[PDB]
Design a protein around this motif. Structure first.
Motif, short mmCIF file in Angstrom:
data_model
loop_
_atom_site.label_atom_id
_atom_site.label_comp_id
_atom_site.label_asym_id
_atom_site.label_seq_id
_atom_site.Cartn_x
_atom_site.Cartn_y
_atom_site.Cartn_z
N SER A 78 0.84 -1.25 0.06
CA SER A 78 -0.05 -0.02 0.04
C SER A 78 0.93 1.28 0.02
N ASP B 297 1.29 4.59 -2.81
CA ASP B 297 1.35 6.04 -2.66
C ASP B 297 0.56 6.36 -1.41
N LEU B 298 -0.70 5.89 -1.10
CA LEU B 298 -1.28 6.29 -0.18
C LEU B 298 -0.72 5.80 1.16
N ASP B 299 0.16 6.43 1.60
CA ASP B 299 1.02 6.39 2.86
C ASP B 299 0.20 6.50 3.94
N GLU C 219 -2.97 9.58 5.81
CA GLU C 219 -3.55 10.75 5.88
C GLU C 219 -2.60 11.95 5.30
#
Length: 63
Positions: free
Chosen positions: A46, A50-52, A54
């Motif tokens: 994940s 890119d979606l590290d 918030e």
């Protein structure tokens, strides 16, 4: 063979790293996945995506 207080597994940590991941990541992931391997790898990939997490500034370092 010592292990008193709860903690993450070594094999897992190894496996992950074995893939070429950061030791910290493995640890984090695990803890992030209630000490989980499968999930970890998932939580890992994940991050790679890119979606590290918030909205939050990222450290200076090219991926």
């Amino acid at each position: 063979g010592s292990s008193g207080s709860s903690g993450p597994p070594e094999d897992c940590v190894t496996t992950i790293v074995s893939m070429g991941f950061s030791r910290d990541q493995a640890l984090k992931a695990l803890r992030a996945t209630n000490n989980s391997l499968e999930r970890a790898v998932d939580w890992i990939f994940s991050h790679i995506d890119d979606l590290d997490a918030e909205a939050a500034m990222s450290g200076p370092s090219s991926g």
